[PDB]
Structures are given as structure tokens and as C-alpha cells.
Design a protein around this ligand. Structure first.
Ligand SMILES: [Mg+2]
Ligand SMILES: [Mg+2]
Ligand SMILES: [Mg+2]
Ligand SMILES: [Mg+2]
Ligand SMILES: [Mg+2]
Ligand SMILES: [Mg+2]
Ligand SMILES: [Mg+2]
Ligand SMILES: [Mg+2]
Ligand SMILES: [Mg+2]
Ligand SMILES: [Mg+2]
Ligand SMILES: [Mg+2]
Ligand SMILES: [Mg+2]
Ligand SMILES: [Mg+2]
Ligand SMILES: [Mg+2]
Ligand SMILES: [Mg+2]
Ligand SMILES: [Mg+2]
Ligand SMILES: [Mg+2]
Ligand SMILES: [Mg+2]
Ligand SMILES: [Mg+2]
Ligand SMILES: [Mg+2]
Ligand SMILES: [Mg+2]
Ligand SMILES: [Mg+2]
Ligand SMILES: [Mg+2]
Ligand SMILES: [Mg+2]
Ligand SMILES: [Mg+2]
Ligand SMILES: [Mg+2]
Ligand SMILES: [Mg+2]
Ligand SMILES: [Mg+2]
Ligand SMILES: [Zn+2]
Lengths: 82, 99, 11, 155, 208, 126, 60, 116
RNA sequence: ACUCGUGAGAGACUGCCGGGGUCAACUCGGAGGAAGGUGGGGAUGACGUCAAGUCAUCAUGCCCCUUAUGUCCAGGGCUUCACACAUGCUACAAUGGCCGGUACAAAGGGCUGCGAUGCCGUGAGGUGGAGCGAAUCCUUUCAAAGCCGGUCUCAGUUCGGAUCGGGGUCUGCAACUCGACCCCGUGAAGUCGGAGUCGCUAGUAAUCGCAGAUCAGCAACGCUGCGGUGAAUACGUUCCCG
RNA sequence: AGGGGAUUGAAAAUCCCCG
RNA sequence: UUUUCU
């Protein structure tokens, strides 16, 4: 866990992009490479294309998902089994 | 009363002898009280490295680094002796901290 | 309510 | 020991009793190298023996020891592709040792809830010749006299 | 992986460090300055045999003594080579640099140099056995020299397989700590590869 | 004054021997308070017993390094050297019982490739 | 060592934590002592050659 | 005795007894029994109904124990499993969740060893 | 004065006595002595072997790429997992666990580092900076196993800590994939381990903490060292191995 | 018979486990 | 005692 004293981490990149999107009231698919920004209530309804390293995965943000770093929801390695 | 502590460092032992001698003489010649070449403990910094590139981690080699230190306490710093110690030329191996 | 749990921490 | 018999160690004497037997016993109960623990265990076992039988501890220890001390043993040798167990006479010391270590080992297998108790009840019971350790010495003697034929190797 | 480096074995005892200074704080700096210096001096002048480089440092002032076979090729009488070198030492900026050249007296008692000789001949076209034997006799003539062992290994003659070959004369007492041994090593550059040349020259013994 | 030093495996003690009764003062405590084990007490009292001069000397001590056992051993040696200082002629008796030998046993340098000292790592030839 | 990386570790990083060591002489990333700034290999070399002032083989 | 749906063992020191409650462990016990003023060195046999009352009142007041606890924890797991979090996927597969080593060990997740 | 610190020096040589020795080497005992017979341990690897290892430390012959097999960055991977091996660590409990009181080390480490008293926390730690480039200051005056006392009564347990949930702290631009540490809960396998097999001959084995390098942080239970407490056995070459 | 351990320089043979 | 091949 990031300590409280620092406050939650969101890179300025998608902070700016998501602000522009929800001020114009338009909900788009935003293309992000940042796995490391935690989710804020500002992000609550939007959709994200996050990088899994091979591609961009669709992620619909909901209420239950706040408190979590984004790339949690785009898995990385593919395991089908043997 | 003024005590000047001349502190001596070296990697080599006998160079610490040379400097001991040099400064004890320079001081005695100018008539100040020299407590003399008082030995401190020797520092030892040890590094064990592997011998080969690429595996064989079992065969190793130890290298060491020793530092020998001597105290020279000069009591009653005659301004002449002071002018002499500022002007002493010591070996490249020896470090003199005059404080 | 996960967002309240969020705001208690940081706010 | 390819070059000859190696020297032996000078067991000191026990301060409270004065038997080297006793300190020998602490050195067979010595575990992980806390000698202090062994010391108070042994001393305690001797004290409990003292209150139960009401008589001197060293004496009952010697007696016990002598009832589990085997004279005869079995040393294995494979001969001609058939392995033979062989009767062999024991010199004294290897006997005190074997008896002691027997006592102790079968002390650790008792149900008596504490080492200081198990040990004591086991010495006390080797005195009366009751214990499983005495049975052990019996076992060795039995399996010695059973093989008496093979003594002819005298090895 | 066998014999340790003779020079390193006797280091506290029979032989001395190649460079004198002391600083704790500045240590790491000083050493990257050294690897720099010895790179420059190993690259620049191969004409005149380079025996040794001893470096000394006091505060700002720095002193590089280079031991060399013939000092004449390391300084043009006009001071041309001296200029090139003092310029390179100012580019490394140990600040002030006092550059001194000292010609080693006996060229054939010096292991590094003998080695360079063998290496040169082996490098041109020369038949290797010859080069070995020559260095041997040469060195063995001079008075201090007690025994000498020259070991050259590689593709020799350019044959494809690695021959090692080794020659000994007199005494070469490696495991003796009081034995002053001079070691030298050189890699001779050839059309077929590189071939290594080690030389041990045992001169007397040190007693202290 | 009398002084002497014992040393056993990284423990030094300095002993001062005094003419009085059988009191032991080690670093400001009694011999029973410091070394509270019968074994050790026996060890320290033994040289006195061998010279049969027990309880003729107040002993003062300064102990450092080692541990209980190491300091015990050192202590014994120091005592036994003090007794050669008081009355030389005991030396044949004392040194026959070994009390005057410095124990030349010390911890081994751990060696690399091994785990500690002599114990080697496991080995499988499969 | 690719010269790229060597000269790339001498640059100022955009984060304080991207700075790593990489020995001066051969430019080897792993096993680099802080005092000398050498990697175990280069260190055993210059040590044996006597170019490291006060280092020396050890025994005890 | 009987407390909060638990059955306290016949003879235990209170601190060890309370530990049979799914919500409590030794620390919470040295807290609770200090707060109530009941000695921790008492048996279960010497406990009274009054004491059981004050106890039940305290620990039901400030502390969640037992069934509710279980249901809640199971609720948090099924929660993070629903939203499709990485930890969720791990819980699904029956693998280790905390970023441990799955190449070799992890048998306490996987269970007994089934050979190929 | 005693240590201790580091310089110089003495001291172990079969030197002195007894016996065997071909009157030779050498061996069995004794004395003196701190030590007795290469006192203990290191560093020290002969000629060569094995086409052993490494063109990824480096250097390099030849061949290949040169619009990529160079190079710059973000994200991912090197941590995946039905398995199988290998080296370790914690265990399976009473010679033990847990709470309280108390005694003894050695070595080391420290500049944009080591960081004290004090104050805030339950605790990781926060606030603060004494004082030190360090036989001085800091790592607390240093330990843990030890000893004294209390409790637990042989049980899947006050054994065991894996796992999982919640709640945090610190490092870093950033702890999701992938950090460590602390708090609360959770509380699994495991009852000394088949065939087989490994280490060790005295301060050794066994067990107990401590420091270091690498390092912003750490996968450290690793590696290298330091000391504490400290055993058993060796009749002897028939057998296995070299 | 087959799978996994174990002896083996590597296989057979042998020895333990397993479905 | 028993020990096949590479
Ligand atoms: Mg140890
Ligand atoms: Mg880094
Ligand atoms: Mg590095
Ligand atoms: Mg030799
Ligand atoms: Mg060899
Ligand atoms: Mg090959
Ligand atoms: Mg290369
Ligand atoms: Mg290449
Ligand atoms: Mg390669
Ligand atoms: Mg990248
Ligand atoms: Mg990555
Ligand atoms: Mg890996
Ligand atoms: Mg394998
Ligand atoms: Mg491990
Ligand atoms: Mg442990
Ligand atoms: Mg527990
Ligand atoms: Mg425990
Ligand atoms: Mg305690
Ligand atoms: Mg030491
Ligand atoms: Mg507090
Ligand atoms: Mg205190
Ligand atoms: Mg439990
Ligand atoms: Mg079970
Ligand atoms: Mg049980
Ligand atoms: Mg078995
Ligand atoms: Mg041996
Ligand atoms: Mg670290
Ligand atoms: Mg065939
Ligand atoms: Zn390097």
C-alpha cells in the first residue's frame, strides 16, 4: 500500500484526460499505458483501454473497483493450462 | 594550554615509522613536548571475491585492506614548531591531519 | 460502500 | 584410526557427588550442548531416586548400571557372501558406555511426563532389574549365545 | 586455473605497490583516473618498451613515472612526445602532472620487456622456438639472473590446435616467498589470433 | 601488590591476590552470584585445593570477554599463576595437575566452500 | 557491455532511482564494489598487479 | 461455560478459553479480560453467569465475532472475485494470491499432491 | 601498576635424559616448558589430464547484420505451473512453549551517511536533531542460547506457522502483474519420516545470536565472517569407496 | 506390463512407492 | 557366492 500521508497515486496524464472527458460530459475510451494509477471516484463511470503489454484491454470502471490500481483488471500472462 | 593533535594514517607500516621519526625529530628540535608515536588499532576492510568468471563459486579469494594509525600529541605549540610542522614534507603514503 | 471507504483514508 | 589408537579424554569429577560415572551420564544426556540443562536433569533424577528408594543415589546408579552392563556382544561380518553375526567379548569401558547410552535412550521413550522423572524411574527400575533397558542387555546376551558356533572366526 | 600471479603473492613482502597515495573519500575517483592513465599509456607508445607505470598523488600535484626500455622514443628531443603525453594527462585532469621517464638499466632482466621481445618476434613472422631460446640466453647472461622460465601458448605457427610450450633454465622457485621473482605477461597480436607469453625471471632472494 | 592474568578463548581476567580469608570478589559480586553453576565453582576452587592453601586468600577479579565458561577457565589459570607468585615451590604440584597450561584451544576460522569450520555442504553424485 | 549502456549509465537519469553502478574498467553491471568502483574480476586483476594502494592478499 | 454461541472448554485459563471464539485470539483476550476486570488466571469451572453476561456485553459491543465475521470475510472474497481483480482470478484458479512462488511450493493452496 | 592497542625481540630445534636402532636415519617413554616432536589454522596447487568451464568480464581470428541481428522509450516478461528433481530454512513439542526479573561476547559498519535523550504511537515508525569522517559519537551501556521465578499437563494442544481477510508504515516518479516490515484476526500440513543417502575425529559436531559486502528498498532462510555454550566415538583393516 | 523415486559414469538387473 | 552391456 502507498502510505496515506502521500495521498493516492494518479499520474497527471490520465488525470488531465479524464477531467477533460467528464467536464465535456463525454464518456470515451481513453488509451492508457499507465498500470500504476489507482482508481479515484472521478473515474467511476468511464472506460479505459489499458496496456497489458501485448495490446489494449477494455476496462469498465464501476463503484466496487475504487481503491485499486488499474492494471489489476487487465491480466498479463496467458495461462490456459496443460 | 594548547594541544595540537597530529594524526597519521597509512596503508604501509614502515612509512608510518618514517613519518613518526620525521615529525618527532622536527618537534624535539624546536623544543615542544611530544607525547610520541602512540599506536591505534588497525582498520581492516575485507572483500571476498570469486576467482573465475562464470561459475565455480566455491573457489574464492580474500583481499584485505589495512590502515595503520599513529597519534602524535604536541603540547605547548611553540610558534616556531608550528611553523615547522606546516612546512614538513611527508611521504605519499602518509596522511597528516593536523588538528 | 467502497468509495466511502476510499474517502475515509484519503478524502 | 588407520595409524593407531587415538588418545582418550580426561572426564572430570562431579562436584556434588564425586563419581565420574555421573558426569559421564550427563555427557550422554547432553543435547545440543547445553551442559547446564543436562546437569540439573541428572541431579534431579538422582534426587527423585533418593526420595523414592530412600537410599544413596550413586550406589543405586552403580547397581543399575551393572545389571544392564553386557559382557558379551554381537559384531556383524559378511563372510563368503553370507552375513554372520558374531559373538565378541567386550572390554570394560565399551560396556559402561553401552549400558549408559542404553539406559538414556530407553529413558527418552518413557511416558512419565518429564525427563527428570523418566530418567529417575528408569534408573530406579534398572536397579530392581525391571526396566526395558535390562531387557535389552538380556537381548544382546541371548543373541550372543545363540550364535556361539560362529565364534570360531574369532574375529 | 593454476598458479597465482607472482607479483600479487609477494606483494606485502618482497615487492611493492605500483602506485602510492592515500585518500578514503577520494578513493574511487583516483582509481578511475588510474585505469584511465594506464589505458592511455598502454595504447599510445608501444614503440619503446613500457616496463612500468608508477603513479603518485599529493593533493593537487600528480606524478607519473614511466619505466621504459629506451627513453629516446618516448621523448622527441624537441619534447614532442612529452607534449602529447602531458596533454593527455591534462585531458584526464589530475590537475598538475609531472611526467618523468626512467630507462630501466638491464633490458633483459626485466620480465615485462623480455616478454615484449619474444612477443614481437613471434608477432612478425619469427619461428617461435627461436624467439624463446634467444630471450633465454640473453636474460641468462646478465649477472643477477639466476633462472628464467618462458612459457608461450596459443596457435603457434598458426596451426589449428593450441600448443603450449615451455622452457626453463636454472632455478625458478615459485612457492618460495623469500624468492624475488619478476613476472611478465604479454599477448602478441598475430594473423591467426593472439598468443600469450609469460616470463618468470628469478633474481636472487630478498632477506629482511 | 600481586597481579596476574588468565586467558581462555577470548576471555581475560586479571586477578589480585590478598592475604585475608576465603572471600571471592568478581566484579562486585560473590563467587556464587557470578558463575552460579557447581561445575564452574569447582573449576575455580580447584587450584587452591591442589595446593591445600584453600581459604588463605581474599581474591579480587576483573573479568572481560568470553562467557561464563570461558571466564571460568581464564579465572582458574590466573589464580594458579598467582599461587606461583606467592610461594614458588608449589609449582611442581600445580603444574602436574595441569592448572598452569594455557588452553591452546580457540574457535576455528570458518572456511569458504564449507558451512562452518569443518562441516561441508551436502553432496550427491547423481 | 554494449557501449550504449556504458555511456547510458553515465548520463543523468530522470529519476534518482534509475542510477546504477557498472564498474569503471570493463563496465560490468553485476558485482561492483563501492569503494573501488571495480567489479570482482577487475579488482582481482589490479589487486594482483599492485595498482590498488593498500589492498593486498589476505590470510588469517 | 457458554459464550456468544461458543462452548468454552472444561478447564482453561480464560485467555486461552476465549480463543475458541472465531473472532478472538490471544491479544484480544488480554484486552477483553483486562477491560472486564475478570482475571485471566481463572478456570472455566469458576466462571459465573454474571461474568458471562458482562463478557457477552463487552465483546458483542466492541468486537465482531463468529458467524457475522465469517459471512463478512466470505463476502470480501466473493466481492474481489466478482469485480474480476487479479486476486479474484487467483481465488478462482485456487492458486496463491499474494504473489508467492507457484513453480514449486504453494501446496497449501493447491492441496495434496496429484502426480503426472 | 594491571589489561589492551601495535612495533621490535625471545621461544621448539628430537635441543636435554632413558630404551630400541647396522651406533645410521628414525621410533617408545621421561624432564623442563605457555607449547613436544610437521603445537592449531591459513595463504601457497608441480608435469599434465578432462577437446571440462567461459567468444556475456575482457581481448580476439574468421564468418554473419548495417536500414537492421545497431540504437532510444513506454508497457510486459525474466516471479508463469498438472508436475519431477536439488540445496536450504521452520517444524512435528515439556531438554518444550508463553509472561516477568537478570548475567556474560567477538568482530565489524558509517557523509548528502550512522543518527542519540526527549515527545507522538500498540507496533512497524513519525517529529527532531545531540554527537561523530569516528579505540572518542552512533550502531543503545551491545547480544541470544544461560540462570531465577510463575503458568501450561501430553492434547493436533497455550505445539506448528503455512494460507486467507481486514487495517497500516517505510523506501521510491511508481509497490497491480512483483517489495519488505508491523497490528488484528484466520490456524492448514505435520505424531521424527520407505528404498536409499550425507556431513563430521576437538573448541570439531550440534545448537545460539551478531556484523558485513551487493543495496533507495528488499525476495537474505543466501553468501562471507565473528564470537557464545559445547559432546559422543575410533576395538581396528576382513568388507564398500578413492 | 506401466508412471515416479533409488542404486549406476549412463543403461539393463535389482529395491521401494503408486493408479 | 551374485555383478549383463556401453
Ligand atoms: Mg561457532
Ligand atoms: Mg538500483
Ligand atoms: Mg550493482
Ligand atoms: Mg609448502
Ligand atoms: Mg596440479
Ligand atoms: Mg567442449
Ligand atoms: Mg567480447
Ligand atoms: Mg563478438
Ligand atoms: Mg555469448
Ligand atoms: Mg524497458
Ligand atoms: Mg520488467
Ligand atoms: Mg531466475
Ligand atoms: Mg534437476
Ligand atoms: Mg533457504
Ligand atoms: Mg534456528
Ligand atoms: Mg505458538
Ligand atoms: Mg517458536
Ligand atoms: Mg526473558
Ligand atoms: Mg579474533
Ligand atoms: Mg512509547
Ligand atoms: Mg539496559
Ligand atoms: Mg496455536
Ligand atoms: Mg493431520
Ligand atoms: Mg504430541
Ligand atoms: Mg529410516
Ligand atoms: Mg581429518
Ligand atoms: Mg541491503
Ligand atoms: Mg547388447
Ligand atoms: Zn570490470
Amino acid at each position: 500500500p502507498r502510505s496515506l500521508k502521500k495521498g493516492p497515486f494518479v499520474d497527471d496524464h490520465l488525470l488531465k484526460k479524464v477531467d477533460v472527458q467528464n467536464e465535456k460530459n463525454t464518456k470515451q475510451v481513453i488509451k492508457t499505458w499507465s498500470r500504476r494509477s489507482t482508481i479515484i471516484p472521478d473515474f467511476i463511470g468511464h472506460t479505459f483501454a489499458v496496456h497489458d503489454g501485448r495490446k489494449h484491454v477494455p476496462v469498465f470502471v464501476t463503484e466496487a473497483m475504487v481503491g485499486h490500481k488499474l492494471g489489476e483488471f487487465a491480466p498479463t500472462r496467458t495461462f490456459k493450462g496443460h | 594550554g594548547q594541544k595540537i593533535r597530529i594524526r597519521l594514517k597509512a596503508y604501509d607500516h614502515e612509512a608510518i615509522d618514517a613519518s613518526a621519526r620525521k615529525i618527532v625529530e622536527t618537534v624535539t628540535r624546536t623544543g615542544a613536548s611530544v607525547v610520541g608515536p602512540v599506536p591505534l588499532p588497525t582498520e581492516k576492510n575485507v572483500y571476498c571475491v570469486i576467482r573465475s568468471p562464470h561459475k565455480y563459486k566455491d573457489s574464492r579469494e580474500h583481499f584485505e585492506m589495512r590502515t595503520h594509525k599513529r597519534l602524535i600529541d604536541i603540547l605547548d605549540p611553540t610558534p616556531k614548531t608550528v611553523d615547522a610542522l606546516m612546512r614538513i614534507d611527508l611521504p605519499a603514503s602518509v596522511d597528516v591531519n593536523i588538528q | 460502500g467502497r468509495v466511502a471507504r476510499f474517502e475515509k483514508r484519503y478524502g | 584410526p588407520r595409524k593407531g589408537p587415538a588418545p582418550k579424554r580426561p572426564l572430570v569429577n562431579d562436584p556434588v557427588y564425586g563419581s565420574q560415572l555421573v558426569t559421564q551420564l550427563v555427557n550422554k544426556v547432553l543435547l545440543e550442548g547445553k551442559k547446564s540443562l543436562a546437569e540439573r536433569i541428572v541431579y534431579g533424577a538422582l534426587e527423585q531416586a533418593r526420595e523414592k528408594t530412600g537410599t544413596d543415589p550413586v550406589v543405586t546408579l552403580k547397581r543399575a548400571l551393572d545389571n544392564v552392563k553386557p559382557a558379551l556382544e554381537v559384531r556383524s561380518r559378511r563372510v563368503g557372501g553370507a552375513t554372520y553375526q558374531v559373538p565378541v567379548e567386550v572390554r570394560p569401558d565399551r560396556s559402561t558406555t553401552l549400558a549408559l547410552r542404553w539406559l538414556v535412550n530407553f529413558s527418552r521413550q518413557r511416558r512419565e511426563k518429564t525427563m527428570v522423572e523418566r530418567l529417575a524411574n528408569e534408573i530406579l527400575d534398572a536397579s530392581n532389574g525391571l526396566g526395558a533397558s535390562v531387557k535389552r542387555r538380556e537381548d544382546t546376551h541371548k543373541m550372543a549365545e545363540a550364535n556361539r558356533a560362529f565364534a570360531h572366526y574369532r574375529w | 586455473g593454476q598458479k597465482i600471479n607472482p607479483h600479487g603473492f609477494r606483494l606485502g613482502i618482497t615487492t611493492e605497490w605500483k602506485s602510492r597515495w592515500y585518500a578514503d573519500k577520494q578513493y574511487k575517483d583516483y582509481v578511475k583516473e588510474d585505469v584511465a592513465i594506464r589505458k592511455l599509456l598502454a595504447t599510445g607508445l608501444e614503440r619503446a618498451g613500457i616496463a612500468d607505470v608508477e603513479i603518485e598523488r599529493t593533493r593537487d600535484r600528480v606524478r607519473v613515472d614511466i619505466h621504459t626500455a629506451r627513453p629516446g622514443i618516448v621523448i622527441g628531443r624537441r619534447g614532442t612526445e612529452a607534449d602529447r603525453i602531458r596533454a593527455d594527462l591534462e585531458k584526464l585532469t589530475g590537475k598538475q602532472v609531472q611526467l618523468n621517464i626512467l630507462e630501466v638499466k638491464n633490458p633483459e632482466s626485466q620480465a615485462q620487456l623480455v616478454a615484449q621481445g619474444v612477443a614481437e618476434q613471434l608477432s612478425n613472422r619469427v619461428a617461435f622456438r627461436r624467439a624463446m631460446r634467444k630471450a633465454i640466453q640473453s636474460a641468462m647472461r646478465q649477472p643477477n639472473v639466476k633462472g628464467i622460465r618462458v612459457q608461450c601458448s596459443g596457435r603457434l605457427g598458426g596451426a589449428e590446435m593450441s600448443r603450449s610450450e615451455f622452457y626453463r633454465e636454472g632455478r625458478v622457485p615459485l612457492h618460495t616467498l623469500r624468492a624475488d621473482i619478476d613476472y611478465g605477461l604479454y599477448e602478441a597480436k598475430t594473423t591467426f589470433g593472439r598468443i600469450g607469453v609469460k616470463v618468470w625471471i628469478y633474481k636472487g632472494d630478498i632477506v629482511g | 601488590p600481586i597481579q596476574t592474568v588468565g586467558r581462555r578463548k577470548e576471555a581475560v581476567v586479571r586477578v589480585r591476590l590478598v592475604p585475608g580469608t576465603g572471600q571471592f570478589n568478581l566484579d562486585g559480586r560473590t563467587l556464587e552470584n557470578y558463575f552460579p553453576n557447581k561445575v564452574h565453582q569447582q573449576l575455580i576452587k580447584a587450584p587452591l585445593v591442589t595446593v591445600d592453601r584453600v581459604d588463605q586468600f581474599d581474591i579480587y577479579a576483573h573479568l572481560d570477554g568470553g562467557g561464563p565458561s570461558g571466564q571460568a577457565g581464564a579465572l582458574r589459570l590466573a589464580i594458579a599463576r598467582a599461587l606461583i607468585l606467592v610461594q614458588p615451590e608449589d609449582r611442581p604440584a600445580l603444574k602436574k595437575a595441569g592448572f598452569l597450561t594455557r588452553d591452546p584451544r580457540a574457535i576455528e576460522r570458518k572456511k569458504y566452500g564449507l558451512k562452518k569450520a569443518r562441516k561441508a555442504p551436502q553432496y550427491s553424485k547423481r | 557491455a554494449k557501449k550504449a549502456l556504458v555511456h547510458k549509465a553515465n548520463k543523468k537519469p530522470k529519476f534518482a532511482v534509475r542510477a546504477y553502478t557498472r564498474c569503471n574498467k570493463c563496465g560490468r553491471p553485476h558485482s561492483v564494489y563501492r569503494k573501488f568502483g571495480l567489479c570482482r574480476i577487475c579488482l582481482r586483476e589490479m589487486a594482483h598487479a599492485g595498482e590498488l594502494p593498500g589492498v593486498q592478499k589476505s590470510s588469517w | 461455560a457458554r459464550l456468544v454461541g461458543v462452548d468454552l472448554p472444561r478447564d482453561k485459563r480464560m485467555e486461552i478459553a476465549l480463543t475458541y471464539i472465531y473472532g478472538i485470539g490471544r491479544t484480544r483476550s488480554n484486552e477483553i479480560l483486562a477491560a472486564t476486570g475478570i482475571d485471566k488466571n481463572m478456570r472455566t469451572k469458576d466462571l459465573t453467569d454474571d461474568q458471562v453476561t458482562v463478557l457477552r456485553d463487552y465483546i458483542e459491543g466492541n468486537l465482531k465475532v463468529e458467524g457475522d465475521l465469517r459471512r463478512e470475510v466470505q463476502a470480501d472474497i466473493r466481492r474481489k472475485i466478482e469485480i474480476g481483480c487479479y486476486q479474484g482470478l487467483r481465488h478462482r484458479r485456487g492458486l496463491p494470491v499474494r504473489g508467492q512462488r507457484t513453480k514449486t511450493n504453494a501446496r497449501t493452496r493447491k492441496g495434496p499432491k496429484r502426480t503426472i
